Amino acid sequence: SLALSLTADQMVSALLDAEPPILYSEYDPTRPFSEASMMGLLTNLADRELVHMINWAKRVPGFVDLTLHDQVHLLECAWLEILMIGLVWRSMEHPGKLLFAPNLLLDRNQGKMVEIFDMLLATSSRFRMMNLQGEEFVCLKSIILLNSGVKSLEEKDHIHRVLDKITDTLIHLMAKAGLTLQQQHQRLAQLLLILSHIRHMSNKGMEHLYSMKCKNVVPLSDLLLEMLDAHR
């Protein structure tokens, strides 16, 4: 392959330039709120991010080595987790605020949604105190893609190798940063424990936006209806 034959620095390099762009919402301050309309903004934003996430996943080392069915499975499983950690990463420098987009900053005071808000806010606050780095973030994001959904099922063994690969990259990054062995191990664990909280937020949100669908109010792109349906 190629993913398995990459140096930690090459790995970090690949992930960095594979990063998706930050998209804008359609938020307009001169326009009245509304739970439904405000949700329209989020779903619309998310739907456009998905298309970028799909092409980002293709550039995650070792992801295209998998059959299409396995790629679809991994995406269906991790799509919301990845949006949420991207969201959390974007909001690091904005305490008490969630930066869905440069033109859309929201605080807990808005929504019907607050509970999940506080979870995201708490996670972002976690990144700050940890001083999470961009190099570390792209690693966590690729780990989610490969981990969350993991005969011929030798693909499973392949995913694991890549996962071990990314683990070495994380450690490699922390070491070059001057951390002691104990600090590296500890930081590695701290980062990986966060993934558990991201899974939780994903499942809470998934069950929530399931209601919005059934509630027959908020518009859902046929792609979202698909992804969502994968979890039911």
Binding site: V51, I54, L68, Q71, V72, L75, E76, D222, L223
Partner: peptide, 9 residues
């Protein structure tokens, strides 16, 4: 699936 084709493209 929409995701399947998107992945193909």
């Amino acid at each position: 699936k929409i995701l399947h084709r998107l992945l193909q493209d």
